[PDB]
Amino acid sequence: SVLQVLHIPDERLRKVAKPVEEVNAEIQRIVDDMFETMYAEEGIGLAATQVDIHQRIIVIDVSENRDERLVLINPELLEKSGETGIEEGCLSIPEQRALVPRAEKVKIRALDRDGKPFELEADGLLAICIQHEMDHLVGKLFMDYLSPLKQQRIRQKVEKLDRLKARA
Ligand SMILES: [Zn+2]
Structure with missing residues (x-):
């Protein structure tokens, strides 16, 4: 199923996710729906809290043939180094x-x-994607890093877009 993706300024985007107790068929259903939703909106990453499911689950697929699926359940940052930045997007902050x-x-x-553990070292786009998606799980958005003026301007952009998109 395709799930609805929340947009700012939805307050449910600020909730802190609980860890997954047990990876069972209910969780695997959620993972599958998350991938379906991500591909349907043309995203390369999705956190569970974006679809109002507040558990520590992330899906990523940067592949163009939509067949290098990466699932992170209860992710844990072991180490990080260096500093970068690209212009990030997010399905919760449409077109910004x-x-x-x-x-x-x-x-x-x-x-x-x-439900099997694994370790992963990432750099480049993947490293950035993982950090962006892990932020979602503790209620953080990429706009939180920007100036108050930049943040307001982003909010307005999105509110105007959702205002037009809802036609009636
Ligand atoms: Zn995002």
Whole structure:
């Protein structure tokens, strides 16, 4: 199923996710719906809290053939180094992009879709994607890094877009 993605300024985007107790068929359903939703809106990453499911689950797929699926359940940042930034987007902040400071390299521990643990070292776009999605799980958005003026301007942009998109 395709789930509805929340937009700012929805307050449910600020909730802190609980860890997944047990990776069972209900969780695997959520993972599958999250991928379906992410591909349907043309995203490369999605956190559970974006679809109003407040558990520590993330899906990523940067591939163009939509077949290098990455699932992070209960991710844990083990180490990070360096600093970078690209203009990030987000399905919760429609059509807005902004450069945000990130670590360049990241090492995480997570569970996969089967509930088996794995470690992953990432750099480049992947490292940035993981950090952006892990932020979502503790109620952080990429706009939080920007000036108050930039933040307001982003909010207004989105509110205006949702105002027009709802036609009637
Ligand atoms: Zn996002």
